Amino acid sequence: IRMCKDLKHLIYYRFNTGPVGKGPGCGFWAAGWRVWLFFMRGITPLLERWLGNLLARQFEGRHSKGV
RNA sequence: GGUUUCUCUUCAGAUCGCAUAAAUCUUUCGCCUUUUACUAAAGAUUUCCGUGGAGAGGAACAAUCUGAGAUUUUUUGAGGCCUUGCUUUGGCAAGGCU
Numbered sequence: 001i002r003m004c005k006d007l008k009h010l011i012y013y014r015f016n017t018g019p020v021g022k023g024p025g026c027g028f029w030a031a032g033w034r035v036w037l038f039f040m041r042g043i044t045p046l047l048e049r050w051l052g053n054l055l056a057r058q059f060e061g062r063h064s065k066g067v
Numbered sequence: 068g069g070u071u072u073c074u075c076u077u078c079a080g081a082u083c084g085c086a087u088a089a090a091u092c093u094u095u096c097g098c099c100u101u102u103u104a105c106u107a108a109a110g111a112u113u114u115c116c117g118u119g120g121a122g123a124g125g126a127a128c129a130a131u132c133u134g135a136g137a138u139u140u141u142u143u144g145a146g147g148c149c150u151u152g153c154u155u156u157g158g159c160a161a162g163g164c165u
């Protein structure tokens with residue numbers, strides 16, 4: 001989120017250079033798309049293993065003794 | 068002596084990635100009642116999204132194509148011919164020859 005804010009400020013301060021000001025119509029999304037999808041390939045297998053443990057506790061039950 | 072494409076197998080040792088995330092563990096911290104969740108640095112590993120080379124199979128389109136394949140200077144007649152030594156008989160070692 002800090003890198004998204006920094007990319008927003010970099011885009012804004014490369015953009016507001018001449019006659020454009022701080023209006024609400026600035027459009028660019030590729031850098032945040034890169035950041036959150038590289039986060040998504042990071043966060044995928046931990047999510048898959050946590051959801052697999054969730055499904056195993058849901059359907060195989062909870063090992064109360066267990067490990 | 069086709070191409071494109073799909074699948075499988077194998078080697079990935081190149082920035083396999085002109086890209087970049089996460090997790091565990093060993094720790095130092097930051098934070099700090101405590102548990103996950105924590106902060107940012109190192110070490111030790113891993114996983115994921117990708118990647119390259121090779122081979123096989125399949126499919127659709129090329130249906131061949133693609134290859135491979137002389138007289139006149141110095142690199143051709145200054146060509147012939149004889150005697151002695153030796154014949155070792157293809158002519159050889161020396162002389163006058165045109």
Ligand SMILES: O=P(O)(O)O[C@H]1[C@H](OP(=O)(O)O)[C@H](OP(=O)(O)O)[C@H](OP(=O)(O)O)[C@@H](OP(=O)(O)O)[C@H]1OP(=O)(O)O
Pocket residue numbers: 008009012022023024
């Ligand atoms: O300096 P800017 O890049 O132009 O930031 C401004 C604004 O106020 P400030 O001028 O005082 O900084 C906000 O501040 P920051 O978070 O960037 O510090 C921010 O608002 P958000 O927090 O919602 O992002 C953002 O607003 P937005 O992203 O909607 O454009 C933006 O606003 P403006 O550029 O329109 O003035």
